Amino acid sequence: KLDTQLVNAGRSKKYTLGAVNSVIQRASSLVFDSVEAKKHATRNRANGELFYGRRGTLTHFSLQQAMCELEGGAGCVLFPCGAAAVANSILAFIEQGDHVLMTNTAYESSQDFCSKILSKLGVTTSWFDPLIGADIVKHLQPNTKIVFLESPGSITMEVHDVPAIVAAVRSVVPDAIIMIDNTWAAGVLFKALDFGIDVSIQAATKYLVGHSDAMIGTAVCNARCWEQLRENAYLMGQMVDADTAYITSRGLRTLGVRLRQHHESSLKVAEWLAEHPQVARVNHPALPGSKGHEFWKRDFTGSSGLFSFVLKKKLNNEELANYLDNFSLFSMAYSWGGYESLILANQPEHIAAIRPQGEIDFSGTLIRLHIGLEDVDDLIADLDAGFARIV
Amino acid sequence: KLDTQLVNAGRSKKYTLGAVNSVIQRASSLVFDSVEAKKHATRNRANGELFYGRRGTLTHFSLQQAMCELEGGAGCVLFPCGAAAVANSILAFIEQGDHVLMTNTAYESSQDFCSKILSKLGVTTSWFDPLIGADIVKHLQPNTKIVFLESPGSITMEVHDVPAIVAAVRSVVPDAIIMIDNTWAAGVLFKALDFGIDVSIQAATKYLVGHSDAMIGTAVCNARCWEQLRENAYLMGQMVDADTAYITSRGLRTLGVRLRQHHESSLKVAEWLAEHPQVARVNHPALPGSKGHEFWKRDFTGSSGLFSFVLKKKLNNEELANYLDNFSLFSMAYSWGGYESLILANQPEHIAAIRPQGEIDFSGTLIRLHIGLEDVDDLIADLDAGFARIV
Amino acid sequence: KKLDTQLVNAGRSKKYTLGAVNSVIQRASSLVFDSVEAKKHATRNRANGELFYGRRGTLTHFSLQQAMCELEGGAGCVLFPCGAAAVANSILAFIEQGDHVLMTNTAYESSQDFCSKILSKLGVTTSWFDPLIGADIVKHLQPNTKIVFLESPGSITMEVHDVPAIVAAVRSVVPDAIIMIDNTWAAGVLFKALDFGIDVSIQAATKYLVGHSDAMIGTAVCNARCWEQLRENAYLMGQMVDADTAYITSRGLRTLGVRLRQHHESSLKVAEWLAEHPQVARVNHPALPGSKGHEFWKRDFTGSSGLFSFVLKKKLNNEELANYLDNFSLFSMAYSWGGYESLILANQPEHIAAIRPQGEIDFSGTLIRLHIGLEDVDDLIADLDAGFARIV
Amino acid sequence: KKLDTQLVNAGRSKKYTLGAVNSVIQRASSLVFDSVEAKKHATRNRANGELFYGRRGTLTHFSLQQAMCELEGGAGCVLFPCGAAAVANSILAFIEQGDHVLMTNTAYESSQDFCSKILSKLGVTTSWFDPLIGADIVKHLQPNTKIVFLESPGSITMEVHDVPAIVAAVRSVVPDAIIMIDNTWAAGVLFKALDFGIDVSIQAATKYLVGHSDAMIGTAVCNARCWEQLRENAYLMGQMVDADTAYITSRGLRTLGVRLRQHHESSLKVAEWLAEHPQVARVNHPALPGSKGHEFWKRDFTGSSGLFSFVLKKKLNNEELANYLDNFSLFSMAYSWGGYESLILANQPEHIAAIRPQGEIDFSGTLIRLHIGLEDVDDLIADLDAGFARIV
């Protein structure tokens, strides 16, 4: 049923108004036809009636309903990008004197927000190894307010044991807000809310948009946490533009066909890399032997196309340029979840800089690949010519 | 020269690329053609080179340059709406233990952010009368970090004596960040940065967009404050979409012709209202006798079209509906700065609720009008039929 | 009925705005029918503003159409992907093999080229008339004349027709002619074409209606007589415009009054200064006394836009042309006009003679066409004066 | 040269992407010339991908054009505001009074109506041929035949032409005919029309290329022989598409492979189930053995899309039609197709007979046209089965 759900999510007649897709209603001012109507809108301003463009128009309401259907949420809060969704969802639940506990494989800008912004506000952050499972209880404090997960991890791809973590957290600090950056799974390949997580956050920028051309963050909330996240992010003025909301809704339509290709291609590339003379290790959650692969197999319903691998060699600057500068099909850029395949290098000392209170376990240059929609054998051919440049 | 500046601001060839207007470059991923190029982009990521869509594309850079030219700034920071610009510009400069001092006529969501969000983060806020001038020194504390102005004030339209306030603040707390919500002036009718203000904030949603169909906040900074505001708002993921940046740039083009009509019409309406049997008081900065009109005349180069007036009567609910429900040309909606004229009522007890540490001085129903681009005599006719419904 | 109030409200019915101030943007090809009964009703009303199929329009197009009918006083508004398509397709909609088309020799060049290169091979002939022919247009009418095509002011040279004289004269000889006008310069609104007994008023909405040089679109506002035939025959040619452009055209209407008043005030001040300037031979501005057809403009228009031309005393050689045009600071060279910025183009007398069929030109200096935008008028005059000093 | 890699990269030259992954969106009418020399160079290259005037395109259009030339193997790509405009205007670009047009009687109805209602009054005649005529097309050729217009598979009834036989036969009699095909169903890519000696491959990019039912646009990819004439004559009619739609069409290309593979796999599974169903008389799916021209599809196409039809054993009366169509849960009624969602439409045999000129129909039950979208195929089959139970 995921394919049927994606096609239809949010496409109620009150939003589509005779069209297949939702209307695009651009607005700040929304007009009240009478004092009575304005009183009704005001009462329902956070309940999907037209009130003011900062709260949404019909376009936003459509995306919101779609995201709640897909991720099994009580509400969906919108932001101008994923980093805004992370920073503001955390902010929405903290106060001076709180502790935040975050996986050390969190997205770097997520870590930065905590280390550079929260620290000045009387909020301390500490870190954990993504494979800690039930042993996370050692890191919990009486003042732990947020436990922030990201599975798989940024760059290095470690999958958490979310069931174990959640049961441990609920046993010790049941008031904690458990959040996950669920971007890799595009919210649909891991049903975070069904595992007891309070908030599922995505850079909708990535697979939901699908084409590398719009930025948008989403936070789907359970009933417990929706009101606080919604109202407190509203107080920070968080919203996304109507057109971007429309394009996000539109990305959902092809999300199933895209994610099946990303899975099929990326796993075939991971398998080929794993057997290559020049590769030390492959980090792909769907690949047997990868860190937390067992948790991927048990808890996810698919894979996307982002993964990494580690070269046997630590490339020097000359070698790095010869490798990365001469790809035919892979491009160097940040982000991912688009239709085109991307490549970035990360030296071991770079990654060690962004694993606080943890330790690196590789020594070669780490390559992160986003496997897009191009013919997989063409991509493999491009990677092999790559290896020949650095043998 | 303002008209020539508006027409040309930001329209460098590197952004327009053969067209009259800037290109619309939609992107998250921005591609690096080599390792050397990526190192160059990285070094210049906050200096107008293409790096990642969260920092901007050519479209954003164009708007940024335009806003810096118009408002005489070192940099322009972008946000998803005005309320986001206010909340995040304040957040960018505070830490636990700070004091914020804000005019009691600040926009209500500005006050709310301080009372509901900052309070939990160890930051206290207090308030001042907008006409306080040099006497503001009584409100300054050793830990005052931000002095937040809004001139004219929201709803009630009081104009500050900005020179007096700034000299007083610099004499007592020279480290304070002085910010102003300069939306009414559309940043161009009051050159805030030239008066020693550190940050000029706008709901670009209002007159810069001009058509009530896009939401966007801007903060133009002096050289002292730009880096901190830019980097700290980036850490909160603040940005606006490319298309909205384009539409903002595009609004600037007609801003002079619009604002001259808004001034001409709104002042003629204010003059007519001032002489009407049913009106107690008119609050329009351009109208002699209005609170701080002298400061308007000395410090501004024009007026926009938003003002208010107070009825002799405090309308009951029946009367409120008869009045507001039967307008032909005025519409009820929030926001303003568009092409169409708007009307809202505010009872005295409502306004008293949002003037902290201050006192109301009127007793009749307050009407706020946005005077748009319609024939002024048609608007006056609509207001007079209005008066006849409540005599 | 005051233009400014009309511009602000035109098309913004609740059924199209749906709670916002502007019309919604409804992007669609497919439009869904909830039942066979609904499908049947939509089919009947497919040319009557019911949702049927995106080629016929969505709510966004219907909004613009209503606005254009209101503003120009028409029974309907047909939409096209640019102004040239509106012209070409509006003429095509009414002709058949064996017809003749009578067109002002001041017509936009692409309109002339459509007649001479397309219509000719379809058995349709074209001839041309001087824009100041007036009542004497009777001399050019044939038994097979189907269309009389006006453009006032003229392209480039700005001659204003005596429309009342032309129209009364055509109707006295060929009452059932389709009279059309390319009314782009007046933005449909400074000259109410349909009130003068013209059947079809065509614009390049590309120009003033959009107002920012960033969208292309053509409109044809038609009387009740001609609406069905234009609409249906244009539809058979697949003519439509995208919903987003329709929205931006509706949105342009909102500032069209404040923009046109600035373009008039500035362009007339420029024109008056140019008339006095010793390097200028003549100024062609409808609003400036002495211009061809000024007295007709005075009588028949309720305002001016910002496009006009002037003729230099010199015929510039190539080196002087370059030195003049290449070094402007505020004026830019580009085609189109009707935007917020000022443009400049040169035309040599021999270039204009080549697009003035069956007629002669009336100047021998280099002609400069100006679009006066929204910049400070004294800055623009300073840029023009610096230009003069480069070709003394 | 693998389709998937081509789709991802087509048109994304650095000069159009300017640092991003997708082409920039350059909205413009005016395009600025920095000097007289630049203006002169832009003028020369105005049909060669230099910025000249928005009616000719911006960088965004040039990107799409390059992508379409690459994908269909053409020398150029002409753009139009919808598919119907592409058809109408591509035919117009090549005809003149006295010509004859030979068109498949399975042609999209609007294409037939253009010929019968527009072309007829311009001295151009049209006749029609059965889509399975093959080599016997020679029987319909006249000395004045200028165009032979193919559509394969056929609209609604889905008959596949033997294109190699038709084309060899036309060239043996009228070598200088312009042969065109409406190649919308194959999305330009499952049938490489230009490799079969067809001159012009036309699509309603509206359908599969856009892929989301929210933009309208037509394309005509032309060989070197025919490109200039199509381009220039289409331009004289003002044909263009907006930059934003061009961008969304380029963007549609990126997922066209993954979408078409799902539409094929799902629609064939549906077709196979329908063939077996006791309330179904026949299935018209190019990929299903037994369908008209299947063996030609097998030989000539590299895949299928998701549009096909089937004929019920019953001719539904009006009450049964309603009960059937009105109560679907996943299929929607709407025109167009090629999007992500599934659509259903009914056509009675007498309705199809009326749009099958110079030929007869081959069925007597109600015909149902299906577009199979991206929904779960077993959900769609369950909705169809519930439909069958409503008309047993």
Author numbering:
A (entry chain A), B (entry chain A): 5 to 395
C (entry chain B), D (entry chain B): 4 to 395
Reproduce the article's own wording on this structure.
In this study, we have addressed these questions by focusing on the two PLP-dependent enzymes alanine racemase (ALR) and cystathionine β-lyase (CBL). E. coli CBL is a homotetramer that catalyzes the formation of l-homocysteine from l-cystathionine. We have demonstrated that two non-homologous specialized enzymes from E. coli are as little as one mutation away from being physiologically relevant replacements for each other.
To test our hypothesis, we solved the unliganded and l-Ala-P-bound structures of CBL(P113S). To our surprise, the mutation did not significantly affect the position of Tyr-111 in the unliganded structure. As observed in wild type CBL, the Tyr-111 side chain forms a π stacking interaction with the pyridine ring of PLP and a hydrogen bond (2.9 Å) with the side chain of Arg-58 from an adjacent monomer (i.e. Arg-58′). All of these interactions remain in the CBL(P113S) structure. In the mutant, nitrogen atom NH1 of Arg-58′ is now within hydrogen bonding distance of the Ser-113 side chain (N-O distance of 3.3 Å). The relevant side chain pKa values were estimated using PROPKA 3.1 (40). This analysis suggested that the introduction of the P113S mutation lowered the side chain pKa values of both Tyr-111 (ΔpKa = −3.2) and Arg-58′ (ΔpKa = −5.5). However, PROPKA 3.1 estimates that the presence of serine at position 113 will lower the theoretical pKa of Tyr-111 to ∼11.5, with or without bound substrate. This is likely due to the new hydrogen bond between Ser-113 and Arg-58′ lowering the pKa of the latter and establishing a proton relay. In contrast, CBL(P113S) showed a 6.5-fold increase in kcat, whereas its Km value for l-Ala was similar to CBL. In contrast, CBL(P113S) showed a 2.9-fold reduction in cystathionine β-elimination, accompanied by a 5.7-fold increase in alanine racemization.
